[PDB]
């Protein structure tokens, strides 16, 4: 199995306050493991999993220090971007960044990422070659030129190929019980009759990890996705996920319809039907 370490920064300007809001969250696969929030009383990087308590106080202090400096960096970035776009300081804007590394089962760097978003759109991205950049427009071309003149890509490539991949290995060992599990969904179909003519069948998948899952409905080897409501996958609140797929069928034909659940924790796909009781 492949694995990822990813960090997510969000900077939000706040017209007439001393500082933007800066939040970082880190994830290994689909598990959140750290956070930093510039608005906390005494902002610090904090664990979000019990097994991160394995890291000593140097780890926390250092993550905290760079987060603070990151917050300063974002403040300047937000100012510069408004300049490029002739946007008044009176208005709030959002800069977002996602970055990290994917590693294969073989344990080595399969792919590195560094992407910026501005007011919800792609802005500037490090290419897969880890030495060139893609700018979304002429503002981002200014940022691209700055990154090229500074040689930013080189420093980031060094992180990815060393530090990133090495720490992900370590996190994967320290949280092995949490992180290396594949908890299959518990699945069942429930019945919800509006009238004597029509009933909604809801196929539920609960308690699963990791997030990726396939729920589909079939009638006779015939796929029903054009009639089904598929909700976005949602968190349990305790480190797992939940999802359902519903479709309206005629009363008395419930047994013609099957729900198929596919997930990494399942040896084979589940195929389920609504069952009396």
């Amino acid at each position: 199995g492949s694995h990822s370490l990813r960090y997510f920064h969000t900077a939000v300007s706040r017209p007439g306050l001393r500082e933007p809001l800066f939040i970082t969250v880190g994830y290994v696969d689909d598990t959140q493991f750290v956070r930093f929030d510039s608005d906390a009383r005494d902002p610090r990087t904090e664990p979000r999993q019990p097994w991160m308590e394995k890291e000593g106080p140097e780890y926390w202090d250092r993550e905290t220090q760079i987060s603070k400096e990151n917050a300063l960096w974002y403040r300047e970035a937000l100012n510069n971007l408004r300049g490029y776009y002739n946007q008044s300081e009176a208005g709030s804007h959002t800069l977002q960044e996602m970055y990290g590394c994917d590693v294969g089962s073989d344990g080595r760097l399969r792919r590195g990422y560094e992407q910026y978003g501005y007011d919800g759109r792609d802005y500037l991205a490090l290419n897969e070659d880890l030495r060139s950049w893609t700018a979304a427009d002429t503002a981002a071309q200014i940022s691209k030129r700055k990154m090229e003149a500074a040689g930013a890509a080189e420093r980031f490539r060094n992180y990815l190929e060393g530090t990133c991949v090495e720490w992900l290995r370590r996190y994967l060992e320290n949280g092995k019980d949490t992180l290396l599990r594949a908890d299959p969904p518990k699945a069942h179909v429930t019945r919800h009759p509006s009238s004597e003519h029509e009933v909604t069948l809801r196929c539920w998948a609960l308690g699963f990890y990791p997030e990726e899952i396939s729920l589909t409905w079939q009638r006779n080897g015939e796929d029903q996705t054009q009639d089904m409501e598929l909700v976005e996958t949602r968190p349990s609140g305790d480190g797992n996920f939940q999802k359902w797929a519903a479709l309206v069928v005629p009363s008395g034909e419930e047994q013609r319809y099957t729900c198929r659940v596919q997930h990494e924790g399942l040896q084979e796909p589940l195929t389920l039907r609504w069952e009396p009781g």
């Binding site: 250092r62 993550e63 800069l95 700055k146 500074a150 420093r155 530090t163």
Partner: peptide, 11 residues
């Protein structure tokens, strides 16, 4: 661990 941003490498 995360990556430190430096002011010399600026958007």
């Amino acid at each position: 661990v995360g990556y430190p941003k430096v002011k010399e490498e600026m958007l």
